[PDB]
Copies of this chain bind each other. A is one copy, B any other.
Amino acid sequence: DEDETTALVCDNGSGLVKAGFAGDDAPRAVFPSIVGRPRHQGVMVGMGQKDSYVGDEAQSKRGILTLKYPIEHGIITNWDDMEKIWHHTFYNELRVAPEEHPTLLTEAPLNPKANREKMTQIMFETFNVPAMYVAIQAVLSLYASGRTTGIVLDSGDGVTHNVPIYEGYALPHAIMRLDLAGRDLTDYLMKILTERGYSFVTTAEREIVRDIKEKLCYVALDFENEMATAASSSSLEKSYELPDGQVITIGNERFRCPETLFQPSFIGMESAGIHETTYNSIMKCDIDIRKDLYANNVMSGGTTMYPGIADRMQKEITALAPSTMKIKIIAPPERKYSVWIGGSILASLSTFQQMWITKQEYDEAGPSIVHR
Contacts and interface: CB of A to CB of B under 8 A. Distances in A.
Interface of A: 42, 44-45, 63, 148, 167-169, 201-207, 241-246, 285-291, 321-325
B167 A246 contact: no
Given A44-B167, A167-B44, A243-B291, A203 B286 contact: yes
A261 to B, nearest CB: 26
Contacts of A169: 42
Nearest to A246: B322
B322 A242 contact: yes
B287 A203 contact: yes
22 contacts: A42-B169, A44-B167, A45-B167, A202-B285, A202-B289, A202-B290, A203-B287, A204-B286, A204-B287, A204-B288, A204-B289, A204-B290, A207-B288, A241-B324, A242-B322, A243-B324, A243-B325, A244-B291, A244-B323, A244-B324, A245-B324, A246-B323
A interface majority secondary structure: loop
Contacts of A42: 169
A204 B282 CA distance: 13
Given A45-B168, A167-B44, A169-B42, A202 B325 contact: no
Q: Which 8 A-B pairs have CB atoms at the shortest separation, nearest pair first?
A: A202-B287, A244-B324, A245-B323, A244-B322, A245-B324, A203-B288, A244-B325, A204-B287
A151 to B, nearest CB: 14
